[PDB]
Structure 1
């Protein structure tokens, strides 16, 4: 251990001595974080390999036996930094990341066990916070000898030495110190390497300042260490202890959230607002794939920003942002489109169901068959809260909680009174309906309504409803057909978009950060007269659709339709980053739903 103490000196050396010209980065970082009460430091393994190779060669060999030692010195480092003596100072956390070298999950077996592995995968579900020991002490049940154990990481049962026997010790719970542990359940990336099979989930565990760092269902990178423990031959459960974890780009986001700030954003986000093309250049962000369909193309944008959400007392609150329908003949690009749309969302879930992929479209509470006691299992809508709703096959959605969609879209909630739990839980999720209409183009010579299940009311529940009609028509094709062979090889259209990147167009991983950005600032609002304009526009929309109904035609319009078009205003306005909205500003939102009014006229 004095060998380990020489290693201790080696790391104290490592910190005090190291230089990037000229400040000692970790050293600054310490006194920086001690007032953060971070009590942790993120160290490049490359500044380490650059400092002394030796210590890594032995670190990479049995890091488990060293990582705590590495901390016992830097926790001492704070002692020689934080304050001078001649409290209480918590035992440090360390989080180390490195560029390293990526390894795929399916190939992880034996071998590399008990070493470092950088890798990504994606988390499925977060385990509840579980607190674990840091310090504990004990008096003897018989001789009353006072023991003090420092419980360190990374099982180990309590030592019995002062009948006395066999092991007469019970924890002094009053004086003990503690830490949280996460128990990540995380899954391999969707792309590799499923081969034919199902995606694996390998279990890992956070602690301290690592906890709650990562959302359920977001792409992430963990480094950690591959290890095993029994957990009822020898057949012990595979797992990875976690150091250090870093979000895949960004992800940051959560919570409240982040910028941070990198000032060039405000300017670059304001210049966007000074670009008259910005609304439309967002439209040109959405489909490098899809040439044309500019209408619905303008329709996607306004959703993601979030629309008006105003909470006015009493508890009455109106939703945002809205709903959209991609229903139309196959060839619409709407699934390809949607597979753009979800990748655009900062946080969302792609549902072609039924519900996705295996998800109860609404959270279905299911008993833990072990230790009984129903617990809510989460849901696609639930996890997608404050994010996009993706729906295919909406012709086929679960009929019982189809209504929970009929509800959650509107009341921004789902009430579960089932079993024990009565909690009404938030889905503020904004739906985009991509289903294929009954019989394709055959509902066009028929009543276009009742197309969606057996009721027209679903349309009212939705907002921006759009029927995409592609006739086989000339030259609108020959140009997109021309667009095609370019799109494929050699991405002759995907190069042509990179000079529009330099000339005009957005990068769209940017578009995430844009829509994340302007959704966290307070809700935009129209001046009075555009609203009264919504009044004389709609009095004629409604007038028109009673007069249209002079033929006794069954149908379509509501008073949530006018309001629907309202939210589109604050959407398109939230583009502007402006607390107000101009008359014409609102007006192209009007022309934007105006096609849906003729969808009512067809």
Structure 2
């Protein structure tokens, strides 16, 4: 019931499937999918992978879980969730994050562990998938593949400095000091036309305070691909990764990395006349995991 618009994802069903996969994953399944059953271990394969990982996550206190998508392919009940994850990055990733938080708090509660749930529910957990299929290069990504998980490998040529990214504006009313904080949604900030107070109403009382806004890290990394396959007469191509938050300042120049993330496209403004955008979209990649 209740699939989201423009997608094939149902929140309840996807959360159910992800919880099922978390509860009942054993590495022997991946061994079966790898046709490596002759290497099946009695110890590690028996033990529940992600439950244990969530445990050491709880004791250590980390907030990020790295998920192998081929493990999702291994589990029969979540084979469809794999394709749902490729085709719909952001929605399914948020679903996974909520499910991780739910599983953490549930596991604490069920065992009645002395560890307090104050930190757990306040924390924000992130899921970082990887090993999501093949590479296919960048010459072979058609525009229909916008906002999908892609796997890229190459050499990190150049790394820009840290670029602050606005998260909350801090407009201040000059007249009645009505300092409202505006969160950014879908990269848009909406100015109060007049003073949001009813008693005080002065449109010119607003003057954004740059310094008291809350920002977030953003680093652009120039990656030159080294695809496993190269078409005839194709010189190497450079793509612009865009990392966020903790991944900033992680990848140094000269590192040979394999990166997975969301293949995005953004209009580029023709600066000849302001607020006029070119019809050709620039393509870049948001980064979720770096190996």
| TM-score of Structure 1 vs Structure 2, range by shorter chain | 0.5 to 0.7
- Cα distance between partner residues in 2 of 1:28 and 1:53: 22
- The equivalent of 1:14 in structure 2 is 21
- Cα distance between partner residues in 2 of 1:245 and 1:95: 9
Q: Counterparts of 1:434-445 in structure 2 under 5 Å?
A: none
- The equivalent of 1:229 in structure 2 is 266
Count of residue correspondences: 241
Higher RCO (C-alpha 8 Å, min separation 6): 2
- The equivalent of 1:87 in structure 2 is 119
- Cα distance between partner residues in 1 of 2:46 and 2:55: 17
Q: Counterparts of 1:189-338 in structure 2 under 5 Å?
A: 189=226, 193=230, 195-196=232-233, 198-232=235-269, 233-246=278-291
The residue matched to 2:101 in structure 1 has which SS?
A: helix
Give the deviation of 1:67 after TM superposition.
1.8
Aligned-residue RMSD, C-alpha: 3.9
- The equivalent of 1:72 in structure 2 is 98
In the alignment, which of 108, 130, 135 is matched to residue 141 of structure 2?
108
Query: Which one has the bigger strand percentage?
Result: 2
| Conserved 8 A contact 1:183-1:205 | yes
- Cα distance between partner residues in 2 of 1:61 and 1:159: 31
The residue matched to 1:29 in structure 2 has which SS?
A: helix
- The equivalent of 1:156 in structure 2 is 187
- Cα distance between partner residues in 2 of 1:219 and 1:169: 46
Instruction: Compute the TM-score of the two structures, normalised by the length of structure 1.
Output: 0.34
Instruction: Flag the 1:36–1:118 CA change in 2: closer, same or farther, 3 A.
Output: same
- Cα distance between partner residues in 1 of 2:195 and 2:211: 22
Give the deviation of 1:105 after TM superposition.
2.7
In the alignment, which of 215, 220, 224 is matched to residue 183 of structure 1?
220
Query: Which one has the bigger helix percentage?
Result: 1
Instruction: Flag the 1:192–1:4 CA change in 2: closer, same or farther, 3 A.
Output: closer
**Structure 1 gap segments, 5+ residues each:** 247-602
Instruction: Flag the 1:87–1:130 CA change in 2: closer, same or farther, 3 A.
Output: farther
| Conserved 8 A contact 1:105-1:193 | no
- Cα distance between partner residues in 1 of 2:141 and 2:258: 16
The residue matched to 2:127 in structure 1 has which SS?
A: strand
| Conserved 8 A contact 2:223-2:239 | yes
Post-superposition CA distance 1:346-375 (Å, at most 9, x none) = xxxxxxxxxxxxxxxxxxxxxxxxxxxxxx
| Conserved 8 A contact 2:132-2:260 | no
Give the deviation of 1:203 after TM superposition.
0.6
Post-superposition CA distance 1:438-458 (Å, at most 9, x none) = xxxxxxxxxxxxxxxxxxxxx
**Structure 2 gap segments, 5+ residues each:** 5-9, 28-44, 109-114, 197-202, 270-277
Give the deviation of 1:124 after TM superposition.
0.9
Give the deviation of 1:169 after TM superposition.
9.3
Post-superposition CA distance 1:219-268 (Å, at most 9, x none) = 2211212111124342221101112221xxxxxxxxxxxxxxxxxxxxxx
- Cα distance between partner residues in 2 of 1:244 and 1:227: 16
Instruction: Flag the 1:86–1:94 CA change in 2: closer, same or farther, 3 A.
Output: closer
Instruction: Flag the 1:46–1:190 CA change in 2: closer, same or farther, 3 A.
Output: closer
**1:31 aligns to 2:78 (yes or no):** no
- The equivalent of 1:454 in structure 2 is none
- Cα distance between partner residues in 1 of 2:171 and 2:259: 40
Give the deviation of 1:48 after TM superposition.
1.5
The residue matched to 2:65 in structure 1 has which SS?
A: strand
| Conserved 8 A contact 1:93-1:208 | no
Q: Comparing 138-147 with 45-54, which one deviates more in the overlay? A: 138-147
Instruction: Flag the 1:72–1:183 CA change in 2: closer, same or farther, 3 A.
Output: farther
**1:42 aligns to 2:66 (yes or no):** yes
Give the deviation of 1:40 after TM superposition.
0.8
